[PDB]
Amino acid sequence: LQLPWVEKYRPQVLSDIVGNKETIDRLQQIAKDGNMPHMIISGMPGIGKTTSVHCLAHELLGRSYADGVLELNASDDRGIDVVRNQIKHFAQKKLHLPPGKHKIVILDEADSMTAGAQQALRRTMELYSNSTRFAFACNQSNKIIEPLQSRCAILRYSKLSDEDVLKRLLQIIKLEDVKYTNDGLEAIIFTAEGDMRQAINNLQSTVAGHGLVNADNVFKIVDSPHPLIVKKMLLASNLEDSIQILRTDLWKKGYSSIDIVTTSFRVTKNLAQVKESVRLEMIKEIGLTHMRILEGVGTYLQLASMLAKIHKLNN
Amino acid sequence: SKENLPWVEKYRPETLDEVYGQNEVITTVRKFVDEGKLPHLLFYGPPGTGKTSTIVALAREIYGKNYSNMVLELNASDDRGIDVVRNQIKDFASTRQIFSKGFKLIILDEADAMTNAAQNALRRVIERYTKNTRFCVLANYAHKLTPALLSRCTRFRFQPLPQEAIERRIANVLVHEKLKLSPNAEKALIELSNGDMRRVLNVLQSCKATLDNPDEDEISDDVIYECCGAPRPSDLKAVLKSILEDDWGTAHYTLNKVRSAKGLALIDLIEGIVKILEDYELQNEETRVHLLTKLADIEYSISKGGNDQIQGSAVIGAIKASFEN
Amino acid sequence: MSFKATITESGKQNIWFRAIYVLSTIQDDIKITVTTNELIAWSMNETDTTLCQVRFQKSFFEEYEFKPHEIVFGENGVQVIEDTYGNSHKLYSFRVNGRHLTTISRKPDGDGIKSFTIAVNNTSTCPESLANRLIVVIEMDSLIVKEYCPQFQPIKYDPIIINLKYKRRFLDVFGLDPKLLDVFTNTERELTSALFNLTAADEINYICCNSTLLKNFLDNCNVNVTDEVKLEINVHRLSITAFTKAVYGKNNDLLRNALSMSNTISTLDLEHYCLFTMKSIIFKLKDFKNFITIGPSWKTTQDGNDNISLWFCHPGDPILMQMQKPGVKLELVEVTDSNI
Amino acid sequence: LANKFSASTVHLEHITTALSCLTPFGSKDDVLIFIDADGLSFVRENNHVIKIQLLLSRELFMSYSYRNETEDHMKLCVKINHILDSVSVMNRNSDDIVECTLSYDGHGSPFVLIFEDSFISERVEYSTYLIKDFDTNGLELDRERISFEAIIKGEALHSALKDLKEIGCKECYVYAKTEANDENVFALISKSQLGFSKIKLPSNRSILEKLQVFDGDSTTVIDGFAVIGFFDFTSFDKIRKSTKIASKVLFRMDVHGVLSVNILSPGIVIEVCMLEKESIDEAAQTEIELLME
Amino acid sequence: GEQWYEKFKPNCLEQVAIHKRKLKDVQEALDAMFLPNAKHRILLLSGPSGCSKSTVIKELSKILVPKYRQNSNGTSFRSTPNEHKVTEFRGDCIVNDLPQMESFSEFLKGARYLVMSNLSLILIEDLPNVFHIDTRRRFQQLILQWLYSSEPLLPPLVICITECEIPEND
């Protein structure tokens, strides 16, 4: 069978990774130099953290990737016993590598590691840093305990810009010989919201669905991100407009009330235009509505009342 | 054996051709299986829209009638902790097909009930074994799914069932059974369905039970209202007219009589009046604010019990005060 | 093949497994040093309060080959030691997980072992994967073959000379039953063959005792409760006491209960006893209890004397303990209490 | 008897042996019972990846009656924990038990187990449950595409399984190769905390009776070709209990990655079918090749 | 590829990045602890990550241990003077014949002997798995027993605890 495009076109080299140009350039510098230190890679989902770390390890270790890399993630056993035995034995292993090269322990989703295992990793890093180096990958850098953070260079990935997403999408289209239009690519980028995994998934879905990537064809399957709809609903100057948006764009499309209220809270947390008093009052009203929904009254009437109270707060 | 089943299960779609109201999603998945390029799927939608039916039908189409041998289905009734993900799901996803029948399928129905730790463990299982396995997640609440899992899945939204699909399914059920439905009865059934086919099927079964002689008796809107015990549109209109035009005593008497005639519940009347007022043309916007706030408060209070007469008087007074602005 | 050796006899396999197991109990990693004449497996605990060393002579193995000049990979373990007579000796030392080696070296419950070979290949014709791995080949009586390649890390060897200094002091102080003269001659021969050379400070005390009585007494001694061992020797008796002191809390509450169990052996029963003219010494019991069970694992009828020799000088000073087998030397050094 | 199926015996070793063999498949799960004129079979499946089927033939029972006419076989499902507990308490006085009888009266009736003593009889009824949609016949060996077959002695295989279990084996690789001059190489390669280890069976007609590689069609014997099967030890080790009592073992691997183990202990016959892992890593393949060459 | 924080590590107490008053307080406390009948038996150091607790402890030990260690009476393990000024507990050490929770108990039972001619400073930075309730209870009991021990002679015991918050984990 044919692999999905997300996995089929996963980059093999750092040069094929787009976005965070300075960070990728630093990674390439490290790869071509060799003296890799303990590092932490943090950022939002689907921006190349796993791809970047794996490509760096591959380029650094060459043929010795199999015997010089130990990869562990949340799907494997990673308790304190694992740190005591498997990681310890790997770090103790005497492996002949080219000068400036070290064994790499990749801990993907390191944030999920237990407190005991994280504390145990301190002594391992202290003892075996001469021949072993650790590459943590996570979404929240603060979820790694401070003693471990103290030894590692931090590297934060930013959300991908529309330009890099468009460039890599054009590369994929050229490889796949996909017919498209500019508006279709713009719609795909808009719906991706900076997540390239979603961008590639939506591109594949659209290409399958109709063959031609148009805006209308893209929007037949992919929907506009609902956080923007919620923001438009909250910022409406008229109660009628807010109610109309809530009905047509959210309720009639099958969005659950709990999702709507959670998204409303998240969006209100980042409303720069509104004042602080109005913002906190809106947060209070949203929380009261959320409490009512959790009790079982997840009705459209409650959301309409929440919108009415928010509009009152605005006035 | 199918005869003894409830209609909600007796009429479960067996093939993707029987799933209505999801033309775009269905066409996309059908053509994906035709080209054998199925990606990881997410089916997000409200209850009774055809997510489980659609995924089971797709599995049947992919693997014929032996899908149970190469499909691993797990739902909220089963334990799906991190240990389950590490052992059972991982071993199934990392093993070869029974007869090299392409790729294996793992269905996680009601995945919004899974814990954060299990979802986090699922990320690398999904990514590593994509060649041999494909994952399907089904959900009603997206906020319970972690961002990584959402990013890994191609999303498909099951909208509330359109009217035409409901009419076609109702016609199919009516030809299957020896049942007759009136156009007004069908309109009322669609209106009360709220885009849920389960409600339609259950109410139709109850209506057939209500008929003294189903072989010849026809289901009218009155039968549907009796079975559901819901208010008629005329009752709601009369109550609203009395509230908005008559005095307090007359409105109280009218509400009491309308409720006692058929034992109607106050919450149903409130919902109907809210639906009616949503289309009203209001020249003052504060009226809408007061209506929404007070009626939501009354609904919340009713949800916890309380005094019924006081709540009805509260509804009357709230409407009158809101419209006095 | 940089190094190779094989064991065939059942008792030799038993003693090898027991020694490896005891060393693994002492420390998580065992150290193996290979020379042209013997193989030394030793271990030291984290606190550096106990050292155990088992030396297998080349005669202990049916086959024995050592080619230090062929080692290429892991050359950090290759060491050259100059002898007092003007000779250069090659050594290769490495570290290996003790638990893994113990698991490899144990006799299966059902099937016996016909041959047990351990080898190291770090020569030019060595695949990169096999580098720094100890090859263990086990042949079963059913013709089944098992192969293991646990990883090892080359290290440097720092010889311990406490035994030599204690022997020299003992010979100087106490150097008549013919057995005593034989012991003196054996000690002199050992000191000469080694690669390295009336004030109260010259105190030394020696006790040769049949290990059967000590083992019988210790069988009832549970180290989990009696964590201290005291030896008190005078010219009429020798007492060994497994004990633990009590600990009192804030309001004189018993945090830890004291216990004591003593056994007395007449000086006649002891093989030999020499004192510097009621000596007392205290140390840890667990390591001694484990160490006393290695020699008996072989059970050799010929020249069968499971006698343990103990040397001690002063409180705080090390206590040395030695046992012998036709081709095995077992040594244990412990740190004694400094009180008094 | 008036029951549709009734089988009585005087040997209590068969029942306890079968229960012990079935135990490694989970102490709290379902067991399928098949009843037919030929005999009674116990079937268990784990994770849709492994299956075990133990058959007790008609000869094993002193009396065996199968009076069902409408259907040629009867299918039921029971909970293994219930039977385990009931037998453990009822079998405490194993010396006195003299008779053991199973009975069943079609769908909707319990599975009846009666232990008859000299003067005391204990009767226990096990409730039955609906059989899961998963078909145990799905995991079967394609008899027309055998990649290789081998015959092994029970004791040697049991010793090898014990050795693998005690070293904490995590991944297992069955390696089978044939050459001229009656040269056979059957080996188990384990990936564990120790690294990569090997257990090789001798090329003699007392532990390895015969070995054949058929090039994936069961017909053409090919020399110089090596068949490698990659399995997770969690499933491979589930045959240790069965091999403990086994007298002879027959391995048969097909091209579809299915391995079948036939265990022969009048007797108890066991079939274990397992699936192979998706693929073998480059490091594992290199280590296996170095070990075998 | 040596890391700078290790390559340029201090080689003497004068180069330690520590406030002068804190260094004086720690040095006086440790020096008093090294007395034959010192009132204080355990010195507990707490603070954030990377504030020179273990570094300053080791630098101070390098001076204090030789000053107070009694000269050996011509006895020692090896030929070298056995430069083991600091004895540290290892939490990842696993031996064959010892349950995990007892490991620390064993360590102290050995550390007690490192006095007088065998004098050494006991440092506890890699703690046992205190997240396990039973292990934490055993650790506390052992600490209390050390504090209330009736042994006339004990070595100075220093416990360095790095204080940090545990991020919420699923």
Ligand SMILES: Nc1ncnc2c1ncn2[C@@H]1O[C@H](COP(=O)(O)OP(=O)(O)OP(O)(O)=S)[C@@H](O)[C@H]1O
């Ligand atoms: N910068 C990028 N350039 C090219 N492709 C990318 C990029 N980021 C993501 N992709 C694509 O998305 C896939 C997933 O990338 P990953 O690096 O695994 O995602 P991620 O950043 O690790 O997100 P998480 O933290 O694992 S949820 C890759 O295989 C690519 O196909």
Ligand SMILES: Nc1ncnc2c1ncn2[C@@H]1O[C@H](COP(=O)(O)OP(=O)(O)OP(O)(O)=S)[C@@H](O)[C@H]1O
């Ligand atoms: N699109 C549809 N076409 C026809 N019948 C449908 C459709 N959706 C639902 N039904 C009917 O409703 C029953 C339940 O459908 P399901 O697919 O199980 O509901 P659902 O979408 O899974 O909702 P949840 O998430 O499980 S509450 C089916 O057995 C059908 O009888």
Ligand SMILES: Nc1ncnc2c1ncn2[C@@H]1O[C@H](COP(=O)(O)OP(=O)(O)OP(O)(O)=S)[C@@H](O)[C@H]1O
């Ligand atoms: N001038 C310096 N002063 C102190 N530490 C230094 C200096 N230069 C380098 N370092 C190193 O910086 C690191 C931090 O010192 P530490 O004492 O280990 O930290 P800490 O206060 O003990 O907290 P933890 O528990 O180790 S995270 C050590 O590895 C030191 O060797």
Ligand SMILES: [Mg+2]
């Ligand atoms: Mg990632």
Ligand SMILES: [Mg+2]
């Ligand atoms: Mg469903």
Ligand SMILES: [Mg+2]
């Ligand atoms: Mg430090």
